[PDB]
């Protein structure tokens, strides 16, 4: 029932359950109890919004706890990612669709309908609700701030609709640039450490290969043409050359 949110990157991106995509642990742990337990068209849309607000508020609360109650930009990014996944679930463009997520889809199918124009109505319901869903995710911050609410998080970056694979590459990039110093320092600190690094970097290449392939299928079917343009936007002075070297074990450090 929306558990305590395992530590950052305690489980790496899983590319094996769904073979065409790599799923982050955060998405697997996304709080969906009220959405799952959803078993007048305008009224039932409202009831959905209420349950989504409750799931979003818990999600935001747990993400704040995961960040040790520090209201910083690291927290905003996690709120940005979880909000987007809520939207892709609501809109139907969620790439996980596993287990409980299949229940929330069928519940959404019964609310908006199965016909072709239903998917456009779920996109319109999300657009008139997404701002309220984002605010719910920071309600725990509002409850714990002794004074007024300061908006260190920015609505525009969170509320803007991107493809899920786009945002997941942004998240994977931040995950990669954090795991890299921890790994290059675990080597500079030896046949096991190299057999461990080169088994870590293989996960990173296999992940990036599956994401960039999912990128191509999504893009074809914002200043971004290649999947590396996403990393240039999201990351601090990101050089694509060094990145392909690192993931191909060519970098002039390894």
């Amino acid at each position: 029932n929306c558990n305590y949110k395992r530590k950052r990157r305690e489980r790496d991106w899983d590319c094996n359950t769904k073979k065409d995509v790599c799923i982050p642990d955060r998405r697997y742990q996304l709080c969906m109890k009220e959405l799952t337990n959803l078993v007048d068209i305008t009224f039932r849309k409202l009831y959905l919004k209420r349950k989504l607000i409750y799931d979003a508020a818990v999600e935001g609360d747990l993400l704040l706890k995961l960040n040790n109650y520090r209201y910083n930009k690291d927290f905003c990014k996690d709120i940005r990612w979880s909000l987007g996944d809520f939207g892709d679930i609501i809109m139907g463009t969620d790439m996980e669709g596993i287990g409980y997520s299949k229940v929330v889809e069928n519940n959404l199918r019964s609310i908006f309908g199965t016909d072709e124009k239903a998917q456009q109505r779920r996109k319109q319901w999300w657009n008139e609700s997404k701002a309220q869903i984002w605010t719910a995710m920071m309600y725990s911050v509002k409850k714990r701030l002794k004074g007024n609410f300061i908006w260190i998080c920015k609505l525009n970056v969170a509320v803007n609709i991107e493809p899920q694979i786009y945002r997941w590459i942004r998240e994977w990039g931040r995950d990669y640039v954090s795991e890299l110093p921890t790994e290059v320092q675990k080597l500079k600190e030896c046949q096991n450490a190299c057999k461990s690094y080169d088994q870590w970097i293989t996960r990173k290449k296999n992940q990036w290969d599956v994401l960039s392939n999912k990128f191509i299928s999504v893009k074809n079917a914002a200043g971004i043409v290649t999947p590396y343009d996403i990393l240039k936007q999201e990351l601090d002075e990101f050089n694509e050359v060094a990145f392909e070297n690192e993931i191909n074990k060519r970098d002039g450090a390894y």
Partner: single-chain antibody
Amino acid sequence: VQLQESGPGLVKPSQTLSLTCNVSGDSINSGDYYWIWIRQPPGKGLEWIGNIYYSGTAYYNPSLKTRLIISIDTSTNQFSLKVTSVTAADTAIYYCARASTTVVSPWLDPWGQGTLVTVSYELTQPSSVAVAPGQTARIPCGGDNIESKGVHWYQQKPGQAPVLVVYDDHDRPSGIPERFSGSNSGNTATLTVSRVEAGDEADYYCQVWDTSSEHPVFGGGTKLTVLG
């Protein structure tokens, strides 16, 4: 934004009571709000009656469901309450109020003037806190893991409708003095009134939102008496 009830004031027992809330300053034809009816027997606390959504849907207090009809008319900016087959236990002041649909924990603001009519989550707060002038009154509100919820506080002076003084556990509306503050930790939320003036003498209700059936839950109330 202003609400106001209008009703008979006296009703023959076996008949049906009819009330009407006229809202001004804002349009009722919007999904942004719940439209709620609250009644209060003389001397007792606050009882939730029912809500209505601008789409026409309405749900009621389960203990009175069979005798309640809440209707809305978007084209005249009003919603109405009807209590059928009334008894002596229905004598009460009836308030209409408004609650947001867009926040995690809705509160009721504003409230109607209130009209007297004559013929499962539980919040626990004490009946009375009594302090001398200038002292510090602390009104506790008990609930199982109440910190997981956002609790609000209303002040009701005698003969008047309740007035929101604290919401989201520590927020004060514009008109409220800073002496009123709010806390919420563990299983107890606390309204703290510092420098207790004589004008602070009123009943104080903590309120929480029931997330399973979407209606407000009130504590029993706490009378704050100033001993002089």
